[PDB]
Amino acid sequence: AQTVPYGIPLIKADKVQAQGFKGANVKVAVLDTGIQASHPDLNVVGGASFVAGEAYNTDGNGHGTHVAGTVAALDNTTGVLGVAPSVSLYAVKVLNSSGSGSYSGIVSGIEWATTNGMDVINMSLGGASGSTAMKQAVDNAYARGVVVVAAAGNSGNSGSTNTIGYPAKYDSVIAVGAVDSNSNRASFSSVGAELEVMAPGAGVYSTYPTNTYATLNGTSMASPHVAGAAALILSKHPNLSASQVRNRLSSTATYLGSSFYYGKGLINVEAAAQ
Ligand SMILES: [Ca+2]
Ligand SMILES: [Ca+2]
Ligand code: NA
């Protein structure tokens, strides 16, 4: 009855969960297209919507619900299993139905998160340009102690060209690229100097509106695996700073090749949370 998506054991989230660490008391904000709150495999504790006309607890696109599922689908007897199934989950709607958002809408969500005390923020979204307000938002969240994770971008490679989008590109943000179930880099994952770590991003099965489950591909899919890992580490070592959590993830990652296409490699939560 409950499926375990390959990504979970691929990053060894399962071993950690077997230790009794599932993210309980860790608050994660999913900055996305909203979350279908009524899905039986998800427990949304609160949120906000910065998109006109849509409440934070519906998802007319599906993207947000899928991403939240990877972080926290409930550990039960149905559907799927999140990386950190006991986290307190907040849906912060910054992208519209069509999956796109404004800088000031994004910026408001990041501030909301900061203000409301989230421990980790996930942003499976990215644009070619950043903005000063956006950079300020992320630098302050991180300086305040929140772990900020964003998808690197689905731009691929070209010659020696950085294809990493914003906000993943800022240095207070962890840029995550995508591997497939064979741990190989997926063709669509952006490349560049800023790429930091890789996680499962191809063929990822998660929660999906209405009350179902679907497979999607994307750096968007990889990101929540890292947000979820951070949450696991915190559940295990609540004492750590954001930068400490960050550093554990990159330092213990499994090496796969050059950092321009792989960052430091694929995350290993079990080694990270030692
Ligand atoms: Ca529900
Ligand atoms: Ca489940
Ligand atoms: Na970055």
Residue 41 marked as a ligand binder = yes
Centroid of ligand 2 to alpha carbon of 65 (angstroms): 14
Residue 166 marked as a ligand binder = no
Known active-site residue 220: yes
Map tokens 């295990």 to a residue: 236
Domains observed in the chain: 1-274 (3.40.50.200)
Please pick, among 39, 63, 66, 225, the residue that the annotation labels catalytic.
63
Ligand in closest contact with the CA of 42: 1
Residue 173 marked as a ligand binder = yes
Centroid of ligand 1 to alpha carbon of 43 (angstroms): 5
Centroid of ligand 1 to alpha carbon of 63 (angstroms): 16
Distance, in Å, from the CA atom of 140 to the CA atom of 132, rounded to the nearest integer, reads 12
Q: Tokens in use for 96?
A: 């519209």
Ligand in closest contact with the CA of 263: 3
138: three-class secondary structure by DSSP:
helix
Residue 208 marked as a ligand binder = no
Q: Tokens in use for 258?
A: 């050059």
The resolution in angstroms reads: 2.0
With contact defined as beta carbons under 8 Å apart, do 149 and 173 qualify? Answer: yes
Known active-site residue 119: no
Residue 57 marked as a ligand binder = no
Centroid of ligand 1 to alpha carbon of 42 (angstroms): 5
Please pick, among 88, 220, 235, 259, the residue that the annotation labels catalytic.
220
Beta-carbon count within 10 A of 181 CB: 13
Three-point CA angle 82, 84, 90, nearest 5°: 90
With contact defined as beta carbons under 8 Å apart, do 147 and 174 qualify? Answer: yes
Four-residue CA torsion sign, 105, 94, 90, 20: negative
Ligand in closest contact with the CA of 226: 3
Closest CA to 93 of 141, 51, 149: 51
Map tokens 């992208």 to a residue: 95
Distance, in Å, from the CA atom of 99 to the CA atom of 65, rounded to the nearest integer, reads 12
Scanning the chain, the segments in alpha helix (DSSP H) are 7-10, 13-18, 63-72, 103-115, 132-143, 219-236, 242-251, 259-262, 269-272
150 Cβ partners below 8 Å, 6+ apart? 122, 123, 124, 125, 126, 167, 168, 173, 174, 175, 176, 223
Centroid of ligand 3 to alpha carbon of 146 (angstroms): 14
The experimental method behind these coordinates is X-ray
With contact defined as beta carbons under 8 Å apart, do 125 and 176 qualify? Answer: no
Distance, in Å, from the CA atom of 25 to the CA atom of 38, rounded to the nearest integer, reads 21
